[PDB]
Amino acid sequence: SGEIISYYDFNYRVRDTVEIIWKPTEVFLKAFLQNQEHETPWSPEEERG
Amino acid sequence: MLFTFFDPIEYAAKTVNKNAPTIPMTDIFRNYKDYFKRALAGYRLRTYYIKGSPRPEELANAIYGNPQLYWVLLMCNDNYDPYYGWITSQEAAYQASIQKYKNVGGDQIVYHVNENGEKFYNLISYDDNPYVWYDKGDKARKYPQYEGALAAVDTYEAAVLENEKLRQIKIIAKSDINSFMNDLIRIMEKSY
Amino acid sequence: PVNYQLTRTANAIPEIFVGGTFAEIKQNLIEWLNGQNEFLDYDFEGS
Amino acid sequence: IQAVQTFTDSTKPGYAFIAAKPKSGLYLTTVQREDIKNYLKDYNLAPITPS
């Protein structure tokens, strides 16, 4: 309801009757997480001894 | 141009990131230092310049040579480090002292230098006590060393003492260098 | 594997050497040049 | 459309069949085959009208 989750595009003007068949076989978008590590801003690189 | 003198080759770097791009690179892998060594045969008795000035890294444009050669001074001393190999401005060693010990210990005493120059290394006196020195451990004493007396060199003095002994170098006398370099090429063109 | 302690690695050039793609070098230098040290007093220009 | 060729066939003058393939599916859909047949009516020529 007022959400507009996803827009799609037909190739060319589907005209009379249309069918969309999900290519992965009956699954909509699927997601995967990413881990974006902390950028460690430093190069003193002190060493013991 | 008495370095280089050959070609870029190509540096594949294929052992890392296969299908890495080939980058033309000045050729530093010839074992140059040998050519110099063998070519030098017969020009020896290169005298001892003693330096005498905290000459910056290049005195080549003053003393023997002087096409700003910046080496044949290197190959002299078989210098591993072109930076700290040559002697440095007196303050530099001091400056070099801190960064060495800055992490641990602060300023210290490296050895106590008996007269006649017998170093000791972690040997410690006790004032207001017997006058005989002890190691930095076995605080029960019982195991004295060097019943005599001497004077510690702390740290700064050592670095000075250590880099200042690094001023003597060979020369090739400003006479041979032209005749010498005229040979040093010949060996190079020889092997190919 | 099963126990995670068996991962180790094959012959591995550490991240210490590797070497630059260019612009990542531009990134690390700027952060070392502008930041943590100067907060520019530079007399050259804005550009 | 992808991969078109047009071939004229003697003994049937006046047609000049064209063969078109979709970049998506296999057969050409209606209101597409119809729409390809237009825009060639503005040009065409002559007798010999498309197929």
From Swiss-Prot, chain A:
Gene that this polypeptide is encoded by: 7
Protein family (similarity comment): Belongs to the T4likevirus baseplate wedge protein gp7 family.
Protein's UniProt name: Baseplate wedge protein gp7
General function of this protein: Intermediate/inner baseplate protein. The gp25-(gp6)2-gp7 module is involved in sheath contraction. Involved in the tail assembly.
Subunit relationships: Heterotrimer with gp6; assembles as a (gp6)2-gp7 heterotrimeric molecule. The (gp6)2-gp7 heterotrimeric molecule further interacts with gp25 and gp53. The gp25-(gp6)2-gp7 module is involved in sheath contraction. Interacts with gp8. Binds to gp10 homotrimer; disulfide-linked. Heteromultimer with gp10; a gp10 molecule is disulfide-linked to gp7 and the other two remaining gp10 molecules form a disulfide bond.
Subcellular localization(s) per the UniProt record: Virion
Organism from which the protein derives: Enterobacteria phage T4
Swiss-Prot record, chain B:
InterPro entries: Phage_T4_Gp53_baseplate_wedge
Entry's induction text: Expressed in the late phase of the viral replicative cycle.
Compartmental location: Virion
Keyword annotations: Late protein, Viral baseplate protein, Viral release from host cell, Viral tail assembly, Viral tail protein, Virion
Domain of life: Viruses
Biological processes, Gene Ontology terms: viral tail assembly
GO cellular component, one term: virus tail, baseplate
Coiled coil: none
Pfam assignment, any one: Phage_gp53
Main location (coarse class): virion
Record has Disulfide bond as a keyword: no
Function: Baseplate protein that is located next to the tail tube (inner baseplate). Involved in the tail assembly. Involved in the tail assembly.
Assembly and oligomerization: Part of the baseplate macromolecular complex which consists of gp5, gp5.4, gp27 (central spike complex); gp6, gp25, gp53 (inner baseplate); gp7, gp8 (intermediate baseplate); gp9, gp10, gp11, gp12 (peripheral); gp48 and gp54 (proximal region of the tail tube). Interacts with gp25 and with the (gp6)2-gp7 heterotrimeric molecule.
Record protein name field: Baseplate wedge protein gp53
UniProt source species: Enterobacteria phage T4
Gene responsible for this protein: 53
Swiss-Prot record, chain D:
Coiled coil: none
Part of the intact protein present: 357 to 407 of 660
Location within or outside the cell: Virion
Protein name: Baseplate wedge protein gp6
Induction: Expressed in the late phase of the viral replicative cycle.
Source species of the chain: Enterobacteria phage T4 (Bacteriophage T4)
Family the UniProt entry places it in: Belongs to the T4likevirus baseplate wedge protein gp6 family.
Subunit structure: Homodimer; each gp6 molecule in the ring interacts with its two neighbors, forming an N-terminal dimer with one and a C-terminal dimer with the other. Heterotrimer with gp7; gp6 is part of a (gp6)2-gp7 heterotrimeric molecule. The (gp6)2-gp7 heterotrimeric molecule further interacts with gp25 and gp53; the gp25-(gp6)2-gp7 module is involved in sheath contraction.
Function (record text): Baseplate protein that is located next to the tail tube (inner baseplate). Involved in the tail assembly. The gp25-(gp6)2-gp7 module is involved in sheath contraction.
